[PDB]
Point group: D2
Chain length 283, copies 4
């Protein structure tokens, strides 16, 4: 079974004061809570069993918002982060959730857009040994974590903010692992996502999914990039008449739910265009 984990805690200090009483991942990107975006991304890869890891104060808010996800044909489960850092700790926290299956991990503040994205993810899910990281062409590689890679798609170096960037590809917050990752994390010595990836690479089992022209990616963690993301979503939706990362639309079009369940869900949203969109969609 396809599983995913969403990292949806943290402090959001760069967003103070708006993240002082509101989790970053609950902030609106246009007309949806931020977390709808990484969540839709998992849904588009056919992942219906998802663990959401958040802080002690805000975990119940996510539960208030998302329930158990059964309304969308999903199974959402929740777990509280024990440590401020050590993101690879996710695989330890969710060892049980993961069981014997392969797992995807996506960061709560990551916004992915692209017609061909699901094809990219289906390939990563199908790969059977190792891991697939997702890389995005940037003009300023020096600013992100940088992956230099093979023509096969195999990673050859991983460098955090390299002064001499080996490539123009930034590593995004979307990752695909086989089951051996839980094992790595347990036997790792704060535990970093980067360490885990370097391991797969050292074994040659690390692939790189390339997001080139046509793709958009935002790490929504600063006042500026939040408002850029909101505007980007608002513009795309208004000009091209489609919703971006609308979980009800995705659940419906992938047959997780029927037109009736959609109508009931559109009820509470009927005072705005979100509800009315869902209705036009089902007929």
């Amino acid at each position: 079974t396809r599983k995913g984990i969403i990292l949806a805690g943290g402090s959001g200090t760069r967003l103070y004061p708006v993240t002082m009483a509101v989790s970053k991942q609950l902030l609106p990107i246009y007309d949806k809570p931020m977390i709808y975006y990484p969540l839709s991304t998992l849904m588009l890869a056919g992942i219906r069993d998802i663990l959401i890891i958040s802080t002690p104060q805000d975990t119940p808010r996510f539960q208030q918002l998302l329930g158990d996800g059964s309304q969308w044909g999903l199974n959402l489960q929740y777990k509280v982060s024990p440590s401020p850092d050590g993101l690879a700790q996710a695989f330890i926290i969710g060892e049980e959730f993961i069981g014997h299956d392969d797992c995807a991990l996506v960061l709560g503040d990551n916004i992915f857009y692209g017609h061909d994205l699901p094809k990219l993810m289906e390939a990563a899910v199908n790969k059977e040994s190792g891991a697939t990281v997702f890389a995005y062409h940037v003009n300023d590689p020096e600013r992100y974590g940088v992956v230099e890679f093979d023509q096969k798609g195999t990673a050859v170096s991983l460098e955090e903010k390299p002064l001499q960037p080996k490539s123009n590809y930034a590593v995004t917050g979307l990752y695909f692992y086989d089951n051996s990752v839980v094992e790595m994390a347990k036997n790792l010595k704060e535990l970093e996502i980067t360490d885990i990836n370097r391991i797969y690479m050292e074994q040659g089992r690390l692939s790189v999914a390339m997001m080139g022209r046509g793709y958009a990616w935002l790490d929504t963690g600063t006042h500026q990039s939040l408002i850029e993301a909101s505007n980007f979503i608002a513009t795309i939706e208004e000009r091209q008449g489609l919703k971006v990362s609308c979980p009800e639309e995705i659940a419906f079009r992938k047959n997780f739910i029927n037109a009736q369940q959609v109508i009931e869900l559109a009820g509470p949203l009927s005072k705005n265009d979100y509800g009315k969109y869902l209705l036009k969609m089902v007929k």
Copy 2:
């Protein structure tokens, strides 16, 4: 003493799903929680004693954000809304807070901008009998609650979404009352509009006019939220000033000194908000 009340609850249903787990008044307008804006507006009128009324679930979040406001030279107090509606119920809820003083009321989703706004508010505070509502020129009066008024500034009719608008002035969510309002509310769901019509019927209702130069947003829809955010971002970036920055207001009105500002700028030093406060104090 100058008192104010902020209505910061409600359901924000037009904003679903973003208001499903986050109070509307905690949503960001650019780089500040929405409530910073109505709160600054009160500060600019010299109001330092403010009651914040919110829902049971979100009231603690506002307290987490704002504390008791002592950091800004304010005295913030909190109270939970008992009824889904009946906004005039504010004066009943805060009867004790208000005591014998005059009171201002501002809605949590109202964003006011204008160089001359404080002059307008100083006049409304100084008026001694009755009430001052704040009106904003709009191209579509039929949309809002409309106030038709005298050349004296005295209201002569109040009409909710009139099909035949008597005027182009919409009533905004900023109101100034004398102490007699608590009394009206007790003896009156209880509407802010009813209360205003009473003052008007007694001739004691003035109208503060916000014409060209002023901006006003009721941030209650996805479209207007993003319009507001963009407006704030644009003004701040192009003209180098912050809109409704409580730390800046507290400092420039001498509620706090340069030191308290520096300590407050600490947590915000990872972005331009903190850095602004620092350039400001020197």
Copy 3:
């Protein structure tokens, strides 16, 4: 036979005063390109390389200054001055000779089309062999545009200018495909109620003969009629946003000419020369290599 197109790039742009008092509307920038780059790319994307541009007497030479004969892009551009303030169907009369025996497309100079699948739509309309294909766009306010109500076959059944009782939510956009019989219609047409030969008149005729198809632009497609101050700035912002966030140029003729093999990487490099002081030139260079 050869694919031909005509761009209507004149008019007064009165809604845009005062910015169109000394500048043709179609030369105004939508972000980083003159407006006319957009309908012009749209034709290129349908593989149309022979294009007639019809403009006003004062501004026709400015278009020529900007575009030359289009040979730099593997095109053949030709120009003709509009004789009458109105009567858009007069295009087919003006270009009777340009058109010769071929089929023709017509696009309005202020129309901005965007959509991944747009070329497939247009290839279909080009291949249809009798009649005409109009292009329709789902709107929320049909009452505001000219409205086409249509069959499940794709055949138009009514055409209504700003209907009070809209028969459909589909607005007719300014992109049309005709077979050669259109020149004939236009020559034998007589003015509407406003004294002039209309594109709309021509379109119903085809519909009355059952030979009028409707290309449907649904979700995924964007369309702007850039003719008011507000819409001009919405269009500019839309282009800037797409280009910046997704790393691609919209309606960049040099990119289109290159990717459809009208021109090689060398011609691109020479064309990128004059634009090397901004991102437009630098984009063209990254594209080649």
Copy 4:
């Protein structure tokens, strides 16, 4: 018999703006709902300058004439002259020696957009200053990018540096300048810089070396744009549209300025609003006059 004069530099190639400036002068491009040149033009009007020389290229000068006429419609006197050289901006004072006569002169660049409630007070001060020149400076976060002026507490310039690696100040020199009549003389007796041409910067350094160069300071509250790139063009348009829409006022609307400063009456406004009645510009002018 002293009169306020200004000169607008409104030629140039706009090469950073290719391809949109290939057949359209940069200064005729729209910033929201007005041709770019409306903005520097309004700026001069707000300083009470009603006699203005517009210098442009040979091909585009007639387009400015088509747009603006002789400015009599706005209570102005507009005159035109064609730039002889691609560069040498100080050549403006030579080209307009006759226009200027014995009067003081202001110079504003065609692509410069100034906004600020208090801007006219600033400019009235500069016009009143009687010996020397006033340059207009704008606080930036990246002084290294512009021409930088370091100055006195008196307001007297003490150094001028083009894109200093070690910026002596955070104040960029904008394209708005006020001169006394002695400037025509400087320009005639000036010799090319290291790039072959008479510079505005050379002229200013001279005033400064004589101590007669003041600095008008535009701090918080003020906006300034040098609209010469695709990005900045669209930022300026957006800024104007936002201010106008949110605050209900027009920015650099010459008909409004002519009317409020009494260059023209409510009737002339109504006739001018006629052609613009199909959009909000016309309709604004009408609401304004009543």
